[PDB]
Design an enzyme around this catalytic site. Structure first.
Site, PDB file in Angstrom:
ATOM      1  N   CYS A   1       3.503   2.147 -12.113  1.00  0.00           N
ATOM      2  CA  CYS A   1       3.679   0.774 -12.608  1.00  0.00           C
ATOM      3  C   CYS A   1       2.580   0.333 -13.575  1.00  0.00           C
ATOM      4  CB  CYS A   1       3.758  -0.217 -11.442  1.00  0.00           C
ATOM      5  SG  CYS A   1       2.631   0.151 -10.083  1.00  0.00           S
TER       6      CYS A   1
ATOM      7  N   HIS B   1       1.307  -7.040 -11.910  1.00  0.00           N
ATOM      8  CA  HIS B   1       0.010  -6.457 -12.238  1.00  0.00           C
ATOM      9  C   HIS B   1      -0.506  -7.026 -13.546  1.00  0.00           C
ATOM     10  CE1 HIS B   1       0.666  -3.746  -9.039  1.00  0.00           C
ATOM     11  NE2 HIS B   1       0.958  -2.640  -9.695  1.00  0.00           N
TER      12      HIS B   1
HETATM   13  O1  LIG Z   1      -0.857   0.271  -6.079  1.00  0.00           O
HETATM   14  C1  LIG Z   1       0.209   0.102  -6.703  1.00  0.00           C
HETATM   15  O2  LIG Z   1       0.373  -0.743  -7.607  1.00  0.00           O
HETATM   16  C2  LIG Z   1       1.370   0.947  -6.301  1.00  0.00           C
HETATM   17  C3  LIG Z   1       1.224   2.396  -6.713  1.00  0.00           C
HETATM   18  C4  LIG Z   1       2.611   3.014  -6.588  1.00  0.00           C
HETATM   19  C5  LIG Z   1       2.653   4.067  -5.505  1.00  0.00           C
HETATM   20  C6  LIG Z   1       2.450   3.688  -4.173  1.00  0.00           C
HETATM   21  C7  LIG Z   1       2.491   4.648  -3.163  1.00  0.00           C
HETATM   22  C8  LIG Z   1       2.739   5.978  -3.490  1.00  0.00           C
HETATM   23  C9  LIG Z   1       2.942   6.352  -4.820  1.00  0.00           C
HETATM   24  C10 LIG Z   1       3.228   7.794  -5.131  1.00  0.00           C
HETATM   25  O3  LIG Z   1       4.427   8.147  -5.228  1.00  0.00           O
HETATM   26  O4  LIG Z   1       2.288   8.599  -5.275  1.00  0.00           O
HETATM   27  C11 LIG Z   1       2.904   5.393  -5.834  1.00  0.00           C
HETATM   28  C12 LIG Z   1       3.132   5.763  -7.282  1.00  0.00           C
HETATM   29  O5  LIG Z   1       2.239   6.380  -7.904  1.00  0.00           O
HETATM   30  O6  LIG Z   1       4.204   5.421  -7.844  1.00  0.00           O
END
Ligand SMILES: O=C(O)CCCc1cccc(C(=O)O)c1C(=O)O
Ligand SMILES: NC(=O)c1ccc[n+]([C@@H]2O[C@H](COP(=O)([O-])OP(=O)(O)OC[C@H]3O[C@@H](n4cnc5c(N)ncnc54)[C@H](OP(=O)(O)O)[C@@H]3O)[C@@H](O)[C@H]2O)c1
Ligand SMILES: NC(=O)c1ccc[n+]([C@@H]2O[C@H](COP(=O)([O-])OP(=O)(O)OC[C@H]3O[C@@H](n4cnc5c(N)ncnc54)[C@H](OP(=O)(O)O)[C@@H]3O)[C@@H](O)[C@H]2O)c1
Ligand SMILES: O=C(O)CCCc1cccc(C(=O)O)c1C(=O)O
Ligand code: NA
Ligand code: NA
Lengths: 357, 359
Positions: free
Chosen positions: A127, A251
């Protein structure tokens, strides 16, 4: 029309996947909602229709044309390859396949061209990365990008529904029960899978995801590596500091760049305004700039505070905000699916390139 | 001992000035609390003593040795010169005198030497600048500083008691009454004096203070100009983005520097740890880093996430946190007063160098 499966339909992203599909142009003949065993059997709406949630298994993807995965890296690793085997085109929101060279990593406004050669899995980027790419691509096109330094201000919904509820509970304890923030108990943030958990209420936590061996977090490194893949330029220097703040959705990012050639600020503003997916909100005389609370619910990425560095000839600062569940996840995914449709790319892949697990 | 006046005793900084003075080594024989006409006649404690609040005036400073001003720039402009004329040494928390060449702009760990030539007013820098200087001075001393890029995460108490109350009210309306953040009504943030006001609850507002003619805000330009003065080096490039977030107390900063010589990160960590006023909280293996909620109530400045840039040889990133009402304001001010005492610098200034504004 298509049979579309949403894998992880019950989560934070899944709910927005549903909303984005309900509002999509995609010709959908059949919708299926997939999740874990504990959600299997419950009912969830698609528009006015009651859809029964199904358990996600290796044999659940027969007849599916498009599967949108937002159920975690482990769920994508296990089942996406079986979906590809079954003839599905997968759009994966997780990080698992992003750096696989057989997998396009796409922001449709920036690198839709990468879709044409897909092997059944298209990865949605992180994101934080997506919104930054929407803001910077129009600048890169005209004056190039030498380096990026970014400090993020990330909403808790990025960490899932549980993190949202933890944040709300913590804030109520402080405001209603007079608990000191440093005395709160936490179970999820900053990272569900890491060892220690800290309060987010009235706090700024400089950790998103777990730490890597170089002392940057995986979130920071994703911003670095995903930028280079999406913009197809490993020469772009990118360093990031990723921080969670007490915001539920959207964000914000303080972005510094140095371009290859000097980019006059009025022209930079115009180039961003003209770029699909980017909205210029920049009128400091009327205190107009992007704001998290205004971005919530919108598919656009909002850019402002655009100004020259005070010293570096080619340096530019800006402020970038987008809904992390929409353009940062569910909308980017649905937009990819719509682009696949446009380009006639929704069809089985002959060659299996992903090992079955 | 000293007669000490606190000007702006009733506000957010004032409450902390009182606490810091109660906990100070300064030999205080008499305390006076000054504020506006609105608070005059009310009572406020100093330890167990009841102190009647006085309206701040031209004539209020007779017999005062030290005056700590935290009542707003206009109040410092109007009354600090009369205090100086009366024989007071003024420690001013406001921006008004900071860039005056007759005024030391002091963080005691960094440039206490500047106090010796004071002319009756010593300025405390901006809170965001102070904590950054505590973190970076030990690095500058050993490896130099070529540039700084900073993005801040600033607590609402920096905008005063009204802003704190506004933030709590907004959060309660959302969390308890189900109000949508965009439907909130704001009266103060981002800037009390500016034309439009926006909600801070579940928001990040990239405006602190008002806009200047170069499209940076005054807060951002203060970090720039104050850094150059405090470190006595106009060649340090400094650009800032200052953002308000939903935190009541303690500012956090994502700080990027480029040094003049390559600064090994383990040595940087050690140099910061060893510097007075700076505490190293940096152990990523156990998820140890500075946090606003841990910094609240401490006079120290906390530094971590220290790491080299992924590409720039001399680039370093870090995370800096301090309580903006303590080291950012009231503690820096009391520490200045204590340092003045240590150096025998609490005494009248014979020559007035500051314009009197009340004919
Ligand atoms: O902190 C944030 O804004 C969310 C980050 C998104 C996220 C959350 C848990 C696991 C994964 C992942 O698949 O590694 C991901 C990702 O990178 O898309
Ligand atoms: N914490 C729990 O004990 C618990 C209990 C029930 C459900 N869940 C799911 O997990 C979330 C709990 O909070 P959160 O912040 O972790 O949610 P989240 O990250 O916002 O969403 C995770 C999503 O991935 C799905 N998922 C997880 N494991 C899966 C698997 N092995 N196969 C297929 N789908 C899978 C979840 O479905 P499921 O809803 O089926 O997990 C959910 O839709 C809920 O949103 C809920 O979706 C968790
Ligand atoms: N070093 C730093 O970074 C830093 C940080 C924060 C604040 N400050 C400075 O401190 C000032 C006040 O900050 P705050 O957060 O304490 O604000 P606050 O909570 O709004 O308190 C304002 C104080 O100023 C007093 N005041 C207002 N008008 C006055 C007048 N005409 N004469 C005398 N006193 C007057 C108020 O008295 P009443 O109660 O009678 O109105 C109150 O005691 C700021 O404007 C700023 O200049 C500096
Ligand atoms: O809001 C913050 O976190 C920092 C700003 C503190 C401040 C607030 C109002 C007026 C002044 C001022 O005196 O101009 C100042 C200052 O620079 O000390
Ligand atoms: Na130290
Ligand atoms: Na002495």
């Amino acid at each position: 029309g298509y049979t579309v499966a949403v894998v992880g339909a019950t989560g934070a992203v899944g709910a927005q996947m549903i909303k984005m599909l309900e509002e999509s142009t995609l010709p959908i003949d059949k919708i299926r909602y997939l999740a874990s065993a504990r959600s299997a059997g419950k009912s969830l709406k698609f528009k006015d229709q009651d859809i029964t949630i199904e358990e996600t298994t290796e044999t659940a993807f027969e007849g599916v044309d498009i599967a949108l995965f937002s159920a975690g890296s482990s769920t994508s690793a296990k089942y996406a390859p079986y979906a590809v085997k079954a003839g599905v085109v997968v759009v994966d929101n997780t990080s698992y396949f992003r750096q696989n060279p057989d997998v396009p990593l796409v922001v449709p406004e920036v690198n839709a061209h990468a879709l044409d050669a897909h092997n059944g899995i298209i990865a949605c980027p992180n994101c934080s990365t997506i919104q930054m790419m929407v803001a910077l691509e129009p600048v890169r096109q005209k004056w190039g990008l030498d380096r990026i330094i970014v400090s993020t201000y990330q909403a808790v919904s990025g960490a899932g529904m549980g993190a949202i509820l933890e944040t709300q509970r913590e804030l109520r304890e402080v405001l209603n029960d007079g608990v000191k923030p440093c005395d709160l108990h936490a179970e999820i943030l900053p990272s569900g899978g890491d060892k220690k958990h800290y309060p987010i209420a009235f706090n700024a936590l400089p950790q998103i995801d777990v730490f890597t061996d170089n002392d940057y977090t995986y979130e920071e490194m994703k911003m670095t590596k995903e930028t280079k893949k999406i913009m197809e330029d490993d020469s772009i220097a990118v360093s990031a500091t990723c921080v969670r703040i007490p915001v539920l959705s959207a964000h914000s990012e303080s972005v510094y760049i140095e371009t290859k050639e000097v980019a006059p600020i009025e022209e930079v503003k115009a180039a961003i305004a003209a770029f699909p997916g980017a909205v210029l909100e920049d009128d400091v005389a009327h205190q107009i700039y992007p704001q998290a609370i205004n971005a919530v619910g919108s598919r656009d990425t909002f850019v402002g505070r655009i100004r020259k560095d005070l010293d570096a000839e080619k340096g530019i600062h800006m402020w970038v905000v987008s809904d992390n569940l929409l353009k940062g996840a569910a909308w980017n995914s649905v937009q990819i699916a719509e682009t696949l449709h446009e380009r006639g790319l929704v069809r089985p892949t002959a060659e299996l390139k992903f090992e079955l697990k």
